[PDB]
Paper text:
Based on biochemical studies and structural comparison with other LOGs, we propose that Cg2612 functions as an [name].
To investigate the function of Cg2612, we determined its crystal structure at a 2.3 Å resolution. We then performed small-angle X-ray scattering (SAXS) experiment to further confirm the dimeric conformation of Cg2612 in solution, and the result indicates that Cg2612 functions as a dimer as observed in other LOGs. The central β-sheet which is formed by seven parallel β-strands is surrounded by eight α-helices. The dimerization interface is mainly composed of α5- and α6-helices, and the α4-helix partially aids in dimerization.
Residue numbers in the entry:
A (entry chain B): 3 to 197
B (entry chain A): 9 to 191
Amino acid sequence: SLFDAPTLQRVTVFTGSALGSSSLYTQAAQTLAKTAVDRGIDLVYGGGKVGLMGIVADAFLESGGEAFGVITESLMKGELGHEKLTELEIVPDMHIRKRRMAELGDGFIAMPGGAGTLEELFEVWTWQQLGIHQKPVALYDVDGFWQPLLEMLEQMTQRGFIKRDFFECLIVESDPHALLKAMQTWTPPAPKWLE
Amino acid sequence: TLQRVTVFTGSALGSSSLYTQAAQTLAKTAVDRGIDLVYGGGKVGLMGIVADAFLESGGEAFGVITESLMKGELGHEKLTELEIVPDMHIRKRRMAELGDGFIAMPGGAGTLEELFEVWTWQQLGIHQKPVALYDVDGFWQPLLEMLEQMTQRGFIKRDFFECLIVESDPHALLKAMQTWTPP
């Protein structure tokens, strides 16, 4: 229906190819995967087998959900792709990879990661602002990991480079049930009233 | 050597005229070095400011813009050359091909997005070009603080974070770019 948000069938997850320095990030990813599958949401992600990327894909498969990785030729030649995925799309470059992860997902989540995770997050958020998609964008704030980013965006907003209304449409939860609940009920803000 | 530099900067002007001025001063400094501008082709915000400044100072400015943004009345019509491309990704492929290095002046989410793409791709060996942050009025300090924590939590190689250029003065910035070596 026209008044309804599309219902989330898949979520695209951005996260590190390292595990990072707390056991907690491995736990927290596992929990989200379980919650996701509980609501019949499947996973789209970058197709890796190590670090949090690997953790989250494995947790998804193990809870009995599905998992669609999208990976490049370069990465597949260097034999870095996960081998037991529901599907694994191999594409010529990093652009197409991001484009395809964004077409496949019904929403985006950023779990802890580094530069690459930021590359992906800001792109999809920018695109939301340009009207290229109207899918929700969320930060999984595991042990406050994303708090420094929020301080940075708050400062950018104050200096006038980001509209407060966009920044406030960013979902940030540390609880996974909350996170996905906000993603399901999310609607984009009316262009009619931005300020 | 550095002949063209790709600049990422905000589509708005920001709440203080300091940014406009720094953007102007940087363009002059780069023209004096013989360096031309490559950027996303807009006339609004600091994009417009920096492109005007390169032109008015005797230098050249090349824009790469999508068909959509052109249609949106955001394009600059008095550049040295303006390429029109299908989409955002071809636009970044081209800005990266044309650039010999990358500078991120103040901006928002659009700027962040371009910045992180080319930084990440430096980490992966896709290119070996300097990436620099023009730290006007400490604008990028909160970003460095975020990166510092990510490095302390295991998600960014310290080695790589240290190869990131950060400078508030434009003569220092361009010299840092000119003498930089890869990680």
